[PDB]
Design a protein around this ligand. Structure first.
Ligand SMILES: OC[C@H]1O[C@H](OC[C@H]2O[C@H](OC[C@H]3O[C@H](OC[C@H]4O[C@H](O[C@]5(CO)O[C@H](CO)[C@@H](O)[C@@H]5O)[C@H](O)[C@@H](O)[C@@H]4O)[C@H](O)[C@@H](O)[C@H]3O)[C@H](O)[C@@H](O)[C@H]2O)[C@H](O)[C@@H](O)[C@H]1O
Length: 386
């Protein structure tokens, strides 16, 4: 044949079209290299299945904060990338941030963030402003309801959409990422109580989604795609989601200017965001073609290649020589403190899982069971403390 075939296991399902075009550009420059792009649903679970099966894809899209990356790096599943030349194209010391045993096993090209998408046009129409406190965010929702408009679009069927919301609910209440994990993860068993002021603050922030008439009709069984469309059409004024959503929203061709804002704290200037490596690649240590796999990763570190991805995606990049958008862009408010302290890492960096945290978050929006949520939190965190 002559040509060799490497596999790229993608999790960026929103960026399927652009990543394939970049792949074709690579294939045209490398005639002896063919790249198969894999896009399967529930890619995170399929990856667990494949790694254990010993069928590790050549290039793997894996989130570098995950416990999966940490465990598999120590096991020797991934190639050491510490002394690669293309790693010098990663600024903000972002590759070093997710080092395992002081060794880099992942190239995080982009960083995701979390906030609230909002309709700038209808905000101007109704004379609404971006909230700076919990109380203001409560009022904003109530003001929208009274105007006969739906504030939030919530994906009840996809609990992972509110992961960033609840994590920031704890973050803004406690002080930051470390402070949130001190209350939740590194506390004593059965420490989380309803009487705890931090918990009372958490409920308050979560109750913003529980305000009368805050959510759209038939939200309980609404998916991630459903809410993207609902926001794009202008059926809902806001939707809480990650920076990964904007490319899907843009594709729906909305007839309004899109904006974002961070989930605020108790008082002004206490707003935070959460995220980690979005487009983040690792190379299999057991690959038959390590030179070809490295050439694919190196290709993505190129500024003119990364620009092509960024122009569609929009999430902040750590790649050198990429012209990024200004404060006029949709993700301006959400990614305002990108690559700073106020951009804390996903809390599941020090958890054994996160799936149940999604469930108990959404379950509260469904039921409003305060004690039930507290019980869910203890049942989730206790096994980790043991
Ligand atoms: O906060 C969420 C997320 O943020 C970071 O990752 C960035 C990532 O975010 C999105 O993708 C999220 C997630 O998508 C997949 O998982 C979806 C769920 O899959 C299962 O659920 C079911 C059960 O059959 O499967 C289908 C989904 O196709 C659903 O019908 C049904 O709910 C699973 O049970 C559940 O736990 C999952 O949430 C994927 O497998 C994951 O790896 C993730 O990618 C964006 O779409 C994507 O572009 C990225 O930007 C962070 O790193 C994550 O840890 C997490 O915290």
């Amino acid at each position: 044949d002559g040509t060799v075939t490497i596999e790229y296991f993608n999790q960026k399902k929103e960026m399927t079209k652009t990543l394939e075009e970049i792949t074709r550009d690579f294939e045209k420059e490398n005639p002896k290299i063919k790249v198969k792009v894999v896009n399967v649903p529930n890619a995170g679970e399929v990856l667990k299945t494949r790694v254990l099966a010993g069928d590790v894809p050549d290039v793997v899209n894996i989130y570098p904060q995950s416990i999966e990356l940490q465990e598999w790096a120590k096991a020797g599943v991934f190639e050491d990338l510490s002394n690669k030349d293309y790693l010098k194209r990663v600024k903000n010391g972002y590759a070093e941030k997710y080092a395992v045993n002081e060794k880099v096993y992942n190239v995080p090209f982009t960083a995701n963030a979390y906030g609230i998408y909002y309709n700038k046009d209808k905000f101007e129409e109704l004379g609404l402003k971006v909230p700076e406190t919990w109380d203001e965010f409560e009022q904003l929702v109530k003001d929208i309801v009274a105007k006969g408009q739906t504030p939030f679009g919530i994906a009840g069927a996809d609990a992972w959409t509110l992961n960033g919301y609840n994590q920031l609910a704890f973050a803004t209440a406690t002080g930051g990422g470390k402070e949130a994990n001190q209350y939740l993860r590194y506390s004593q068993p059965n420490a989380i109580k309803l009487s705890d002021p931090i918990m009372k603050d958490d409920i308050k922030v979560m109750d913003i989604l529980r305000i009368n008439g805050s959510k759209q009709k038939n939200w309980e069984g609404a998916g991630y795609t459903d809410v993207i469309g609902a926001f794009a059409r202008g059926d809902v004024l806001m939707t809480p989601n990650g920076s990964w959503a904007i490319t899907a929203i843009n594709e729906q061709k909305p007839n309004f200017k899109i904006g974002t804002f961070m989930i605020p704290g108790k008082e002004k200037g206490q707003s935070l965001t959460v995220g980690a490596g979005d487009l983040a690649w690792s190379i299999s240590a057991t690959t038959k073609h390590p030179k070809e796999a490295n050439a694919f990763v190196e290709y993505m570190t190129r500024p003119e290649v990364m620009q092509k991805y960024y122009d569609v995606d929009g999430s902040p990049t750590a790649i050198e020589g990429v012209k990024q958008a200004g404060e006029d862009s949709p993700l301006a408010g959400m990614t305002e403190y990108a690559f700073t302290d106020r951009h804390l890492v996903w809390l599941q960096q020090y958890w054994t899982s996160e799936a149940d945290f999604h469930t108990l978050t959404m379950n509260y929006v469904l039921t409003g069971d305060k004690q039930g949520m507290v019980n869910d939190l203890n049942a989730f965190f206790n096994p980790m403390k043991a």
